[model samples]
Target: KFDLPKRYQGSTKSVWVEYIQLAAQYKPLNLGQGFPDYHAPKYALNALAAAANSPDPLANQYTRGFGHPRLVQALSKLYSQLVDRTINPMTEVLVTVGAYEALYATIQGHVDEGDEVIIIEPFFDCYEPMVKAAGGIPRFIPLKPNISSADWVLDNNELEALFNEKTKMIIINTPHNPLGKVMDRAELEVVANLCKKWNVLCVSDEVYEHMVFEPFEHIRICTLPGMWERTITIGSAGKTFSLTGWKIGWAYGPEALLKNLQMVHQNCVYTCATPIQEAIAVGFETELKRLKSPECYFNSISGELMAKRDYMASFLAEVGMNPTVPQGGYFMVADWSSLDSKVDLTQETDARKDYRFTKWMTKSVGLQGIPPSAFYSEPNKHLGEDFVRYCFFKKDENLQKAAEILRKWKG
Candidate 1:
């Protein structure tokens, strides 16, 4: 057998894989992964069905290498208006397998060996690994947590100090995963100023753009003056439309920057599925027409999820956990440390308390949540050890099931 490359020779185990196995063995009420168990919107499903069954055989075959023509056009039409600039469908947009690939390509294409990449802590788990795989050093700064996810603040000094001449890029996830903090204009300006100061690239992951609650606004950092050239905004139809299995995502920015990611995409995934792109394009086209109306799925979904967010928060609070009320996104991280006494820590053999807690809860309490430490770097892992993340994107019945599990365990 050949020796594995140094980068690929580590522990190789992942939190998601381990947790998924445990979940399968125990068959717990899984709130572990961030995904919806509910049905997708009718329009999206219908469009997909239409694309699959259409008499036009091209719908089933590959179209363009960079992005499907219809999908890119729809994306350009939607985002050009949002960013207040014209985006060329042919050059500025790229479709990938999922937001996961969009992220991978961005990291692989732009990051050079020995370059530094600034990553916000408690980030989506993939960011760190991707940076390392690209032979880049990941510099992390954790967001200090508080009552509301919106109050999860990054120290300006700590953030600014991470940047230097070797810094190549900074990844920011608005309506951040697990935390659900929709970075306000002031918060974004802090990062944007640094990118401008250091001439760093900004990878703005905005997959949850349509999931913002009432008071919280999702601001696209690329829309800020002078940022359009240096920022690439990534989006997901999976997150936006609640069809996670579709695996469709896109990145849009100045052609010069996107060209880097495009080359990566071309070599890795020539094109995403044809029918799925057509379906997403149809979804975008339909939503664009009624964007201002309350009937728009974007507006309606966020409104419904706000109620779900509150519902999950209320139940977690009732069961003695303090949840950081999310301003946007489907997942919420709660302080599971308070419920430590309720769990028999001896049941699990994990080193991290959050890991043991989530594992024990999954087996005994019959509910499963992801350990938040998985989202942090080893040095900052302690920061997330006290929290567990649960997705509230499930149907009401499933949310109630989790509530029941917590309530029973509390007694």
Candidate 2:
């Protein structure tokens, strides 16, 4: 009986972290969300403290509606150094509540009613709901698992057929969530060409831009030819600096598109936290100097995360739960076929077996996971029911604890 739009009314809380607070309060470990238990770098933390103690009393108040000047400048400089294109701090950059808000704003500001948006399967859960809220229809294409390469590859023909005059945008997440597959330069080129041919906008989520592994490269979609004008690149300081609670993120693109997003941002949140923006600006200006070096925080964190990813994957295999090793993000998906008893019982219900299995695991083993079905539009058609995602972005000891819990599960 709610009169709200069907899209807005149908949204659900992200199951990944919703149960963490209660689960951790009772049991011991929580590997559900991709947050680290450890503290961020000393420099980033110190910058936040310094920003709080700054003489500018107005720093404690609301500042720019679109972006704080200092943060925008730092973002421009940092991105210019990292990518091949030039970015204007004043017009092209926008500060958002987080990457999530940036995504919502971009979709709302760009797509019109009845428009079609192409999303990759196993994408971040926010994209579908956001598209729906914008009065757009979400069309999903899956990235097929390549067992030989340990990477997820998109089906080009399937992707090509999804684009037409009605296509408004395509959401591309590199170092993709739940699967952690980083789209390389060639993959980006293909996507860029499709966008160009279809005259579609590209909403590139590069939150894990700094987390690529060896033999894999993270290509900025905006860097692709003819894409700079059509692509809105979204990134998060929380993900980059391990400060999820800070909730500071940015979007950069051509001013023509950014002007619309700015309007959406103005109507929605208006502005982000001023002091946090200053702190992140400082981090990007100073600590970012070490970005490409071995001593850099980005490099060191990725190196450690890669080790953790391998550890968790091996542990899953040891417990007879074979996971596809991830390339970038702090997550991996594994088949739950090992738990045949639960699967067999759930198979006759006409419901997703993975959903049933995950619920049972949470209640029985006290280990929480997000059902992969939650990431799909037609939850049953995507084969999303066959697997469950586990976050590997935890301390080695914490991952070991999760492994121990799964190892002892009788079902």
C-alpha local distance difference test of each model:
0.90, 0.81
At residue 377, candidate 1 shows an lDDT of 85
Stretches of candidate 1 off by over 4 Å are: none
Output candidate 2 Cα RMSD.
Answer: 2.5
Candidate 2: regions farther than 4 A off: 5-7, 16-18, 21-28, 148-150, 342-350, 379-382
Query: Candidate 2 residues 1-411, lDDT tens each?
Result: 658666578666676554565466556466667778788888889888988898989978988998889999989988877676678998989999999899989999998899999999877888988888888998988877653124668888888899998999999998888788888778888899989998999999999888877767777889888998899999999999989999989899999989999989999999889889998888887766766789786777778788888888887777677688777877778877766653335433336666666666666677766677777767434467777788877877888888788777644
Evaluated at residue 382, the lDDT of candidate 2 is 49
Q: In terms of lDDT, which candidate is strongest? A: 1
TM-score of 1: 0.98
Clashing residue pairs, backbone N/CA/C < 3 A, model 2: none
TM-scores for every candidate against the unseen true structure: 0.98, 0.93
